[PDB]
Design a protein around this ligand. Structure first.
Ligand SMILES: NC[C@H](N)c1ccc2c(c1)OCCO2
Ligand SMILES: NC[C@H](N)c1ccc2c(c1)OCCO2
Lengths: 300, 237
C-alpha cells in the first residue's frame, strides 16, 4: 500500500481519491492519504470550497514514483509533485502516519468497483492523451478541451482523445457510402481497432478514461468522447463477441457508479436510447440495459 | 442553414445552386396477389435536379432494374439519389459545379452529405419552402421520357422554355412553382387550362405552350383560381 502525503491544507477543499471524497477545513491538520491500493491507476482531485469553479486533479500510479501534494498560493491550487529523495519521502510519511494525520483509502474488502472502472486504464496511455512529458502524473480539469473540440484553443493544455467523426472520410470508404454510414463495422474494426488502437483493450482504456474524466471533473469533451466510443460499437453490425460481452460489463459499472443527481448532465438521451433500443447491439447489453431501466427510466 | 421566405432572392443570385427533389425516384403501384396478399410493382422514376436561376433541369431517369433484388428500397432510394447527384457534380466542369445543393426533403441531408465529403466547400442545405416538384411527372414530355426508358439515362431540359428572354429568373421560378402547384392539386383541370385553346401549341423543343405575355397573365390567374377553388373544396370554405 502506498501513500500521497500533503505538505498542508491551507484552503478549505473537497478532496477526491478515486470514487471517494472528503472535506478538509481551512488549515486543518491534514497530511495526506495512506493505504492507497497498489496495482491500479488512481486520481486525486479537488474542488475548492470558496470557488467551486474548476474541479481539477491528477492521475498517477504509485508504482512509478513517490508523489505528494503541496498548495501553491501563487497559482491558487493544490499541485502534485514528485519527491526524488526516497529516504526523505519515507521519513515524512512515517512521521505523518505516527501522528495519525492521514486518512486511510476507505476500500471495503468486497468492493472491486475501482478495478472494474479502471480495468483497461494504464498510465502510459493516459500520458499520451494528456501531454506533459516532464511529469509522471497527469493533470486534468473541468475546462480542458479536446483536440476535436479545438478543430471545430491552447494545444499544450488539450485532451488528445482519438477523433471519432461519423461523417468523415476516415469513417466512410469511397464507394461504400450507404454501407459504411448505416453500419460502422469498417470504421470500428479496420480504422479504429486494427489501425489506431491496435486492440480492444486500448480502445476500452480510452473509453473508461473519458468516462472518469467526465464524472470526476464534469469535463464536457470527455463526456462527448465516452458517448462516441459507445455509439461506434453499438452502431456496428460486426463486433467481436468478447468485446460485446465486456462492454456490457464495463457500461454497467459506469452507470451504477455515476452520482444519481448528475445523470441529467452526464448522460446523452439520444445516444443511450439509440444504443439500447435501436442499434445493431440493442440486444447485446443485458446488464447495462437492466441497470439503466431500473436506475434512470426517465432518460428512456 | 435552411432556406425559407426570408432569403428567397438568394435563389436568383450568381452563386450556382441546385435543388434536388427525390420524391419520384422510387415509384410503386400496390396491388393484390393471387393468394390475397399485397405486392408492389415498381415503375421508372427520376431525380429532379434543377438550377432555379437558369432553368436547367438534370433529369436522371431511374430504371426499375436498379431495384432488382434490393431490400429497404425507400432507404436505398435516398442513397441512390445522393450517389447520382454526386456523380453529376463530378461530371461537371469545376466552374459549373454548384456552391450549394438544396434538398427538398430533410431525409436527403445525411445521404448527400456523406456522398459529398470530397466537396467540403459545397453546402448541403434543407429548405422551409414547400416546393411542388413532385408534380414534375405531370409535365407530359418529362413523364414520356421516363416511362419509355429501357435503361438508366440522363436527359437535360430547360424547364423555363424561352421565358428568360422576357422575364427574370425570379418571375420564371414563381411561374413554374404556380404551374406545378396547380398540376399537383388538380392535374386534369390544370392541363385543361394549359391546352384549352387549340391555337396555342407547345413547340417541339419546349415543355409548355407558347403563350404571349398577356396570355401568361390570363393563364396564371386561372391557375390561382384553380388552387383557390380546390382549397375551398378541400376545407369546405
Ligand atoms: N483501507 C482500510 C481502512 N481501514 C478503511 C476501510 C474502510 C473504511 C475506512 C477505512 O474508513 C471509513 C470508511 O470505510
Ligand atoms: N461473461 C461475463 C461478462 N464479463 C459480464 C457481462 C456483464 C456483466 C458482468 C460480467 O458482471 C458485471 C455486470 O455485467
Amino acid at each position: 500500500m502506498n501513500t500521497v502525503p500533503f505538505t498542508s491544507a491551507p484552503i478549505e477543499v473537497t478532496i477526491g481519491i478515486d470514487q471517494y471524497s472528503f472535506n478538509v477545513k481551512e488549515n486543518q491538520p491534514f497530511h495526506g492519504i495512506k493505504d492507497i491500493p497498489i496495482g491500479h491507476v488512481h486520481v486525486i482531485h479537488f474542488q475548492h470550497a470558496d470557488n467551486s469553479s474548476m474541479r481539477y486533479g491528477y492521475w498517477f500510479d504509485c508504482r512509478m514514483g513517490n508523489f505528494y501534494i503541496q498548495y501553491d498560493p501563487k497559482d491558487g491550487l493544490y499541485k502534485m509533485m514528485e519527491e526524488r529523495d526516497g529516504a526523505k519521502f519515507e521519513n515524512i510519511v512515517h512521521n505523518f502516519k505516527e501522528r495519525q494525520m492521514m486518512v486511510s483509502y476507505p476500500k471495503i474488502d468486497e468492493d472491486d468497483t475501482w478495478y472494474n472502472l479502471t480495468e483497461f486504464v494504464q498510465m502510459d496511455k493516459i500520458r499520451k492523451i494528456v501531454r506533459k512529458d516532464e511529469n509522471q502524473f497527469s493533470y486534468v480539469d473541468s475546462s480542458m478541451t479536446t483536440v476535436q473540440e479545438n478543430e471545430l484553443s491552447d494545444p499544450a493544455h488539450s485532451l488528445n482523445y482519438t477523433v471519432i467523426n461519423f461523417k468523415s472520410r476516415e469513417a466512410i470508404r469511397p464507394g461504400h457510402e450507404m454501407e459504411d454510414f448505416l453500419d460502422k463495422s469498417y470504421y470500428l474494426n479496420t480504422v479504429m481497432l486494427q489501425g489506431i488502437f491496435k486492440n480492444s483493450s486500448n480502445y476500452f482504456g480510452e473509453l473508461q478514461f473519458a468516462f472518469l474524466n467526465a464524472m470526476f471533473f464534469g469535463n464536457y469533451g470527455s463526456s462527448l468522447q465516452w458517448h462516441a466510443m459507445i455509439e461506434l460499437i453499438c452502431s456496428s453490425a460486426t463486433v467481436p463477441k468478447h468485446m460485446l460481452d465486456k462492454l456490457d460489463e464495463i457500461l454497467y459499472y459506469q452507470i451504477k457508479t455515476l452520482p444519481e443527481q448528475y445523470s441529467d448532465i452526464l448522460l446523452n438521451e439520444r445516444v443511450w436510447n439509440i444504443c439500447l433500443y435501436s442499434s445493431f447491439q440493442k440486444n447485446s447489453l443485458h446488464n447495462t440495459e437492466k441497470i439503466m431501466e431500473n436506475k434512470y427510466p426517465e432518460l428512456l | 442553414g435552411a432556406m425559407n421566405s426570408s432569403n428567397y432572392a438568394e435563389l436568383f443570385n450568381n452563386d450556382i445552386k441546385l435543388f434536388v427533389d427525390d420524391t419520384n425516384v422510387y415509384r410503386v403501384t400496390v396491388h393484390k396477389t393471387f393468394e390475397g396478399n399485397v405486392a408492389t410493382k415498381a415503375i421508372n422514376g427520376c431525380i429532379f435536379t434543377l438550377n432555379p436561376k437558369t432553368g436547367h433541369l438534370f433529369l436522371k431517369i431511374i430504371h426499375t432494374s436498379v431495384w432488382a433484388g434490393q431490400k429497404r428500397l425507400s432507404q436505398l432510394a435516398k442513397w441512390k439519389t445522393a450517389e447520382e447527384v454526386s456523380a453529376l457534380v463530378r461530371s461537371l466542369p469545376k466552374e459549373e459545379q454548384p456552391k450549394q445543393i438544396i434538398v427538398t426533403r430533410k431525409a436527403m441531408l445525411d445521404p448527400l452529405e456523406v456522398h459529398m465529403l470530397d466537396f467540403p466547400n459545397i453546402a448541403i442545405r434543407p429548405t422551409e419552402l414547400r416546393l411542388p416538384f413532385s408534380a414534375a411527372m405531370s409535365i407530359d414530355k418529362l413523364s414520356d421520357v421516363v416511362m419509355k426508358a429501357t435503361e438508366p439515362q440522363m436527359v437535360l431540359f430547360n424547364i423555363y422554355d424561352d421565358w428568360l428572354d422576357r422575364i427574370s429568373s425570379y418571375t420564371a421560378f414563381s411561374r413554374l412553382t404556380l404551374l406545378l402547384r396547380a398540376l399537383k392539386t388538380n392535374e386534369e383541370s390544370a392541363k385543361m387550362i394549359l391546352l384549352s385553346d387549340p391555337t396555342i401549341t407547345i413547340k417541339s423543343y419546349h415543355l409548355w405552350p407558347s403563350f404571349t405575355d398577356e396570355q401568361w397573365i390570363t393563364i396564371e390567374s386561372q391557375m390561382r383560381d384553380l388552387i383557390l377553388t380546390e382549397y375551398g373544396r378541400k376545407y369546405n370554405v
